[PDB]
Scaffold this motif. Structure first.
Motif, mmCIF file in Angstrom:
data_model
loop_
_atom_site.group_PDB
_atom_site.id
_atom_site.type_symbol
_atom_site.label_atom_id
_atom_site.label_comp_id
_atom_site.label_asym_id
_atom_site.label_seq_id
_atom_site.Cartn_x
_atom_site.Cartn_y
_atom_site.Cartn_z
ATOM 1 N N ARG A 1 7.712 -2.164 -3.239
ATOM 2 C CA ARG A 1 6.259 -2.480 -3.129
ATOM 3 C C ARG A 1 5.349 -1.483 -2.924
ATOM 4 O O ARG A 1 5.501 -0.481 -2.173
ATOM 5 C CB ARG A 1 6.251 -3.582 -2.025
ATOM 6 C CG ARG A 1 4.905 -3.610 -1.354
ATOM 7 C CD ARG A 1 4.795 -4.492 -0.298
ATOM 8 N NE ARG A 1 3.493 -5.438 0.031
ATOM 9 C CZ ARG A 1 3.489 -5.910 1.159
ATOM 10 N NH1 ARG A 1 3.965 -5.827 1.952
ATOM 11 N NH2 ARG A 1 2.287 -6.622 1.008
ATOM 12 N N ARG B 1 1.591 -0.268 -2.298
ATOM 13 C CA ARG B 1 0.233 -0.540 -1.780
ATOM 14 C C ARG B 1 -0.918 -0.553 -2.646
ATOM 15 O O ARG B 1 -0.797 0.355 -3.753
ATOM 16 C CB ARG B 1 0.389 0.091 -0.307
ATOM 17 C CG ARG B 1 0.203 1.310 -0.449
ATOM 18 C CD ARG B 1 -0.469 1.694 0.899
ATOM 19 N NE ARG B 1 -0.639 3.197 1.128
ATOM 20 C CZ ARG B 1 -1.284 3.906 0.244
ATOM 21 N NH1 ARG B 1 -2.384 3.583 -0.483
ATOM 22 N NH2 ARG B 1 -1.271 5.282 0.434
ATOM 23 N N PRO B 2 -1.952 -0.988 -2.302
ATOM 24 C CA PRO B 2 -3.403 -0.696 -2.808
ATOM 25 C C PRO B 2 -3.699 0.515 -2.328
ATOM 26 O O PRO B 2 -3.384 0.900 -1.290
ATOM 27 C CB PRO B 2 -4.078 -1.775 -2.382
ATOM 28 C CG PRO B 2 -3.612 -2.617 -1.479
ATOM 29 C CD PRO B 2 -2.174 -2.325 -1.382
HETATM 30 N N1 LIG Z 1 0.442 -3.788 0.808
HETATM 31 C C1 LIG Z 1 -0.513 -3.628 1.480
HETATM 32 N N2 LIG Z 1 -1.708 -4.341 1.572
HETATM 33 C C2 LIG Z 1 -2.723 -3.884 2.041
HETATM 34 N N3 LIG Z 1 -2.794 -2.735 3.113
HETATM 35 C C3 LIG Z 1 -1.606 -2.166 3.201
HETATM 36 C C4 LIG Z 1 -0.561 -2.461 2.561
HETATM 37 N N4 LIG Z 1 0.775 -1.533 2.912
HETATM 38 C C5 LIG Z 1 0.121 -0.464 3.822
HETATM 39 N N5 LIG Z 1 -1.337 -1.077 4.021
HETATM 40 C C6 LIG Z 1 -2.150 -0.463 4.907
HETATM 41 O O1 LIG Z 1 -2.162 1.233 4.983
HETATM 42 C C7 LIG Z 1 -1.780 1.848 6.281
HETATM 43 C C8 LIG Z 1 -0.623 2.294 6.328
HETATM 44 O O2 LIG Z 1 0.476 1.299 6.383
HETATM 45 P P1 LIG Z 1 1.608 1.495 7.354
HETATM 46 O O3 LIG Z 1 2.428 0.106 7.466
HETATM 47 O O4 LIG Z 1 1.123 1.852 8.674
HETATM 48 O O5 LIG Z 1 2.464 2.672 6.641
HETATM 49 P P2 LIG Z 1 3.928 3.351 7.146
HETATM 50 O O6 LIG Z 1 4.464 2.274 8.240
HETATM 51 O O7 LIG Z 1 4.891 3.292 6.261
HETATM 52 O O8 LIG Z 1 3.586 4.600 7.749
HETATM 53 C C9 LIG Z 1 -2.145 0.627 7.145
HETATM 54 O O9 LIG Z 1 -3.584 0.828 7.621
HETATM 55 C C10 LIG Z 1 -2.027 -0.799 6.393
HETATM 56 O O10 LIG Z 1 -3.129 -1.633 6.823
#
Ligand SMILES: Nc1ncnc2c1ncn2[C@@H]1O[C@H](COP(=O)(O)OP(=O)(O)O)[C@@H](O)[C@H]1O
Ligand SMILES: N[C@@H](CSC(c1ccccc1)(c1ccccc1)c1ccc(Cl)cc1)C(=O)O
Ligand SMILES: N[C@@H](CSC(c1ccccc1)(c1ccccc1)c1ccc(Cl)cc1)C(=O)O
Ligand SMILES: N[C@@H](CSC(c1ccccc1)(c1ccccc1)c1ccc(Cl)cc1)C(=O)O
Ligand SMILES: Nc1ncnc2c1ncn2[C@@H]1O[C@H](COP(=O)(O)OP(=O)(O)O)[C@@H](O)[C@H]1O
Ligand SMILES: Nc1ncnc2c1ncn2[C@@H]1O[C@H](COP(=O)(O)OP(=O)(O)O)[C@@H](O)[C@H]1O
Ligand SMILES: [Cl-]
Ligand SMILES: [Mg+2]
Ligand SMILES: [Mg+2]
Ligand SMILES: [Mg+2]
Lengths: 329, 328, 328
Positions: free
Chosen positions: B8, B10-11
Motif C-alpha cells: 500500500r 500512501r499519498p
Molecule cells: N494511506 C494513507 N492515506 C492518508 N494518510 C496516510 C496514509 N498512510 C499514512 N498516512 C499519514 O502519514 C503519517 C505517518 O503515518 P504512520 O501510520 O504514522 O507511519 P508509520 O506508522 O509507518 O510510521 C500520518 O500522519 C498518517 O496520517
C-alpha cells in the motif's frame, strides 16, 4: 575495608506525571535495600541487598552529612587522606548529595540552607571544629573536572574554562601526582567559602555549554587540604596534613576513568596484588587517598522508578562488589 | 499455502508537498503490479517492477483495505482458524495508519463510522456485527503488547505504570506458541465497550513514548483478538493477530534483525530457523512457517527521497511470498 | 608544481565571546606561519608552528582572500589550465563563508559589491569583467553538485525535486576524469544572469537540508565553472572547481575517509591510490596528483576549546604541501 552506603531519591515531576510505581524498598534499621524485580509477570519476586547504611527518599541532607562525613572528617583532622565518592545513574542525586542546591530567593544563609550537600557542609564544619579546638591551621581547596580524559580547573583565575591542566608523577611521593596548573585557594575563614563555590559553579555552567553531555560524562573532584601546626616545648614544628576528596563521578548508565575505578575498587577488595591506578586520570589523582590505611566511602544513589529497573539493579551489583555483606533472615 | 503480500502506497504528506517531491512509484491495481523509477536525473527509463497479491495506490481508502484484505481473513478466523496480518515498511509510510488508523478531528463522526479508522477498530466492529446476527454464543478477548528493546509492555493492563514488564515462556501446550506472563486479556462484552479500551490503549502508549527513546519507530505492536464460538456441543476457537512492526529502516534492533534472518532461512530453506533469538520471532513463530495463515501489508512512500528504502521494502516483501504456511 | 596550501583563521563568534574564549592561534602573514599555543594552564611555552604558502589572520576580509588566492588562479584558468580550490576544516570554521560567502542584510549592496561575498560570486564577476575586455569570443558555463552519503544531487537542475540523484561514469576521453550523468550545465551569457542562478542553487540547497540529517555539515559542495575561448584558430578550455568539503571532525563519511587515505598515499608514494573508493576522490582525481593545479584553504577557529581539531586540521593540511601535480 571501604564503607558503602545507598541513597534512594524520591520521585521527580516526570515520574509522578507518568504515574511511576516504586520498586525499591529501603529498610534503615535492617541496613537493607529491597528491589521488586518481576514487573507484571511476578509480583512477589525480590532481590535484596545489605549495606553499611541505607537512606530513604526521606533522608535530609544533614542526616547524610552526620552519618557519613563526620567520622571521616575526624580522620582527615588526625592527618590522613580520604575520599568520598557519589555513584550512580544520571538523574539519581549524585550532585544533590555531593554538593546540594540553593534554596530559591535567598531564604537561609548558605550554611543554614537545608538543601546544601556534603561539600559546603564539610567546609563549614572544618572551621567550626578547628577554630574552637585551639591550634593553628590553614585550609586550601581545589576543584577540577575530567571529561574525555582531559582536565579542567573550575577555580582558576583564567577566564576560559577550556584551558587544560596536566598531570605528572610527583617525585616527592610515589603514590602521588602533580596537577600542573591546578589552582588551589586558601580559604582564610568561613566567610570566604561561598564566593569560591559560586565562581566554581559559574565555570561549570560554562563548561556544560561547550562540550556535549558535559554534566553526565564528567567527574568532579573537590579537594580539601588542611594544614595543622603544633610547636613543641622547645620550638620545633610538627605539621599534620589532612586531605579530603569529594568525588562526584560520571553517570553509570550503559569512559576510561569510570571502568578503571571499578577495577581498582575490585583489586582492593579481593586483594589482587597489582592495582591499576595508572590506567585512568581519575584513579591516578585518587591513588594517594586509596589503598586502605585511609577511610573510603561510596554513596550509591538509586532511583525508585520501575522504569529504571536495570540501571538500579546495576548500580546495586556494583556497590555490592565494592563490599559484600551476606543478608540476614 | 503461501503468505499473501500486498503493498500500500500512501499519498504525499505536507512536507513532501512543500519540498516539491516527485513520485517514483506507479501502482497498477489491476495487474497487481508496482513499478519504481530508479534512475533519477541520470537514467529516466530504468524501473524495478514487482507483482503482488494486491496493490493499493495512493488514493486507496481505509474501507477498501478492509473489504479487500481483512474481510476474507476475518471469515477464516470466524471458521476457527488462526490468522496474522503484519504491516512492514519504513517510518512515516503508514503502518500505524493502516493497522490502527486515526480519529477525524472535531468528533465529526462516530468511532465506528470514521473513515480514518484502521484495521483494528473495523475488525472489532465486524466481529460484533457478524456474530450477534448469526446467533451463535460467543466471547471476545483482547490484548495489546509492545516490544521495545527486547522488553515486553502491556498497553491494556490495569496497572497505572506502563513500564511494568511482561515475561515470555515457551507454551508447554503448543509446540510453536508462547505464554506472555502477566498479559491482561480484556473481555469485550460488546461493541459499546470497544472504544474506551482502545482509548486507554492509546493513552498508555502515549506515556510509553515520553519515557523511552524513539519509542514510536523502534517498537513493535502486537494486538490480539480471541473469539470463542459455541454452536451435541460444538466450539470453535479463532485467533487474529494484528502486528505493527518497528520501522524497517532500522538490544535495540534485535527483533527486526531476527525477523529478516528468520525470513531468509525460510525462503532459502536452511534447516534451522532462528525463531528463538528475538521476542518478536518467538511470538510470530506460528505465523512464519507454522499453521497460522499470514498476510503482510508492505507500506511505501511515493517520494523520490525514499528510493532506497522503498526498494528495500519491496524486495523484502516480494521474497516473503515464497514462505509456505499450512492452516489447521 | 606542489599543491599550494593556505590557512584562514576566522574571528571569534558570539558563543566564544559569551564563553570568554582565549585565543591559541597566532598568524604571521609575513613569515607565513601559524603558531598554536598547546600547553593550556600546565605549560605556557609549548607551541606548534607551521609554515604555509600563505596565512590569513582573523582580520582578513573576503576581498583580501580573493586577491591573494584566486586572482592568480583565475589568470591560469583563462590561459586554459585546470584549477581546483578546496576548503578543508572543522564545522563552523568558515568553509562555506570562504567559498561562497553570505549576502549582507536588507539589500544594502549589489551582489557584486557585497563585502561578504565569497569566492564563487567574485570569480563569476571577475570572469566577465576580464573577458568582456579582451573581445575574444568566449562562453561560460557553471554547475554545482553536492555529495551526501555517497549520493549526488544537482542544485542547478530545472527539476523541482532536489533529491533526484545523478550518477557517475568513467570519462572515456580522459583516464583520470568522470562524467556526471544528468548534470545540468548552465550557460551564463552575461554577469546580469549570475545572481538568479546562485539564488536558485541556494534555495534548492535549503530544501535539501530539511530533507536529510545534518545535510549541511556532512555534505560536499562542488561548484564548477568552464570557460571556452575561441582564439591561431583554436578552442582553449579553462576549468575551475570550487569545492567546499564536509566538516573534518567527521557511506556517510566515506568521502572524507577516502580523501584522507588518498592524501596519505600521495605523500608516501604508494602503489595504488584508492581514488575509486568514494565519489569525491573520483571527482577530484585530477586535482590530487593529476594535471589539475590545486589549492587548499585550511580553515581554523582561534579558540582554546578547539585545540585538538585545529592541530589536526593543520597537520592534515600541512602534509598536503609535499604532494605534486603536473599542470596541463
Ligand atoms: N494511506 C494513507 N492515506 C492518508 N494518510 C496516510 C496514509 N498512510 C499514512 N498516512 C499519514 O502519514 C503519517 C505517518 O503515518 P504512520 O501510520 O504514522 O507511519 P508509520 O506508522 O509507518 O510510521 C500520518 O500522519 C498518517 O496520517
Ligand atoms: N548543584 C549546584 C551547586 S549549589 C552551591 C551554589 C550554587 C549557586 C551559587 C553558589 C553556590 C551551594 C548550595 C548551597 C550552599 C552552598 C553552595 C554549590 C555547592 C557546592 C559547589 Cl562545589 C558549588 C556550588 C550546581 O552545581 O549548579
Ligand atoms: N493510532 C493512534 C490512535 S487512533 C484510535 C483512537 C485514538 C484516540 C482515542 C481513541 C481511539 C482509533 C481511531 C479510529 C477509530 C477507532 C480507534 C485507536 C485505534 C487503535 C488502537 Cl489499538 C488504539 C486507538 C495511536 O497510535 O495513538
Ligand atoms: N551561505 C549561503 C550563500 S551566499 C550567496 C547567496 C545567498 C543568498 C541568495 C543568493 C546568493 C551570495 C552572496 C554574495 C554575493 C552573491 C551570492 C551565494 C554564494 C554562492 C552560491 Cl553557490 C550561492 C549563493 C548559502 O548557501 O545559504
Ligand atoms: N534526595 C533528593 N531529594 C530531592 N531531590 C533530589 C534528591 N536527589 C536528587 N534530586 C533532584 O533530582 C535532580 C537530579 O539530581 P542530580 O543531583 O542532578 O543527580 P545526578 O548528579 O546523579 O545527575 C535534581 O534537580 C535534584 O533536585
Ligand atoms: N572569516 C570570517 N569572518 C567573519 N565571519 C566568519 C568568517 N568565517 C566564518 N564566519 C562565520 O562563522 C559562521 C560559520 O561559518 P561557515 O562558513 O558556515 O563554517 P563551515 O562552512 O566551515 O561549517 C558563519 O555564520 C560565518 O558568519
Ligand atoms: Cl502529514
Ligand atoms: Mg550529575
Ligand atoms: Mg508507527
Ligand atoms: Mg558549511
Amino acid at each position: 575495608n571501604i564503607q558503602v552506603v545507598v541513597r534512594c531519591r524520591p520521585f521527580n515531576l516526570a515520574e509522578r506525571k507518568a504515574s511511576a510505581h516504586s520498586i525499591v524498598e529501603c529498610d534503615p534499621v535492617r541496613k537493607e535495600v529491597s528491589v521488586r524485580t518481576g514487573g507484571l509477570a511476578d509480583k512477589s519476586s525480590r532481590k535484596t541487598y545489605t549495606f553499611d547504611m541505607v537512606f530513604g527518599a526521606s533522608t535530609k541532607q544533614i542526616d547524610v552529612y552526620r552519618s557519613v562525613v563526620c567520622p571521616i572528617l575526624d580522620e582527615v583532622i588526625m592527618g590522613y587522606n580520604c575520599t568520598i565518592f557519589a555513584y550512580g545513574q544520571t538523574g539519581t542525586g549524585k550532585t544533590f548529595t555531593m554538593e546540594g542546591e540553593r534554596s530559591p530567593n535567598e531564604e537561609y544563609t548558605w550554611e543554614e540552607d537545608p538543601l546544601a550537600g556534603i561539600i559546603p557542609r564539610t567546609l563549614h564544619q572544618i572551621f567550626e571544629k578547628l577554630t574552637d579546638n585551639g591550634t593553628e591551621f590553614s585550609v586550601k581547596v581545589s576543584l577540577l573536572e575530567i571529561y574525555n580524559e582531559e582536565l579542567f580547573d573550575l577555580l582558576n583565575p583564567s577566564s576560559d574554562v577550556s584551558e587544560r591542566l596536566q598531570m605528572f608523577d610527583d617525585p616527592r611521593n610515589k603514590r602521588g601526582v602533580i596537577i600542573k596548573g591546578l589552582e588551589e585557594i586558601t580559604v582564610h575563614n568561613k566567610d570566604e567559602v561561598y564566593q569560591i563555590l559560586e565562581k566554581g559553579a559559574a565555570k561549570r555552567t560554562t563548561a556544560a555549554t561547550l562540550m556535549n553531555a558535559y554534566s553526565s560524562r564528567s567527574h568532579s573532584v573537590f579537594s580539601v587540604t588542611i594544614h595543622m601546626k603544633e610547636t613543641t616545648i622547645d620550638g620545633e614544628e610538627l605539621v599534620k596534613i589532612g586531605k579530603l576528596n569529594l568525588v562526584d563521578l560520571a553517570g553509570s548508565e550503559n569512559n576510561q576513568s569510570l571502568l578503571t575505578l571499578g577495577r581498582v575498587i575490585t583489586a582492593l577488595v579481593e586483594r589482587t596484588p597489582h592495582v591499576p591506578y595508572r590506567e585512568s586520570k581519575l584513579t591516578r589523582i585518587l591513588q594517594d587517598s586509596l589503598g586502605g590505611r585511609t577511610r573510603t566511602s561510596i554513596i550509591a544513589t538509586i532511583s525508585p522508578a520501575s522504569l529504571n529497573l536495570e540501571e538500579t539493579l546495576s548500580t546495586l551489583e556494583y556497590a555490592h562488589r565494592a563490599k559484600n555483606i551476606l543478608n540476614k533472615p
